[PDB]
Amino acid sequence: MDDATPAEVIEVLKRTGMTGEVMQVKCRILDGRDKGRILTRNVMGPIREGDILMLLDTIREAKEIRTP
Numbered sequence: 001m002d003d004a005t006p007a008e009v010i011e012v013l014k015r016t017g018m019t020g021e022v023m024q025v026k027c028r029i030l031d032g033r034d035k036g037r038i039l040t041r042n043v044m045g046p047i048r049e050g051d052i053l054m055l056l057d058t059i060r061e062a063k064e065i066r067t068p
Contacts, residue, residue, distance in 0.1 A: 004054030
């Protein structure tokens with residue numbers, strides 16, 4: 001229904017001024033099935049601990065090996 005769970009930024013990762021393009025922040029699951037789940041993602045804009053982010057289930061891709 002909600003897909004993503006409501007959470008508030010707890011920790012922010014900031015290293016030096018401009019060194020990339022997108023800023024990354026740390027947030028911890030405030031509620032959900034996992035709860036306490038902390039995930040890090042790159043988000044553009046001045047966002048620091050205290051903000052609210054959405055936790056969407058990440059799908060893992062399978063790596064295929066190609067032989068000659």
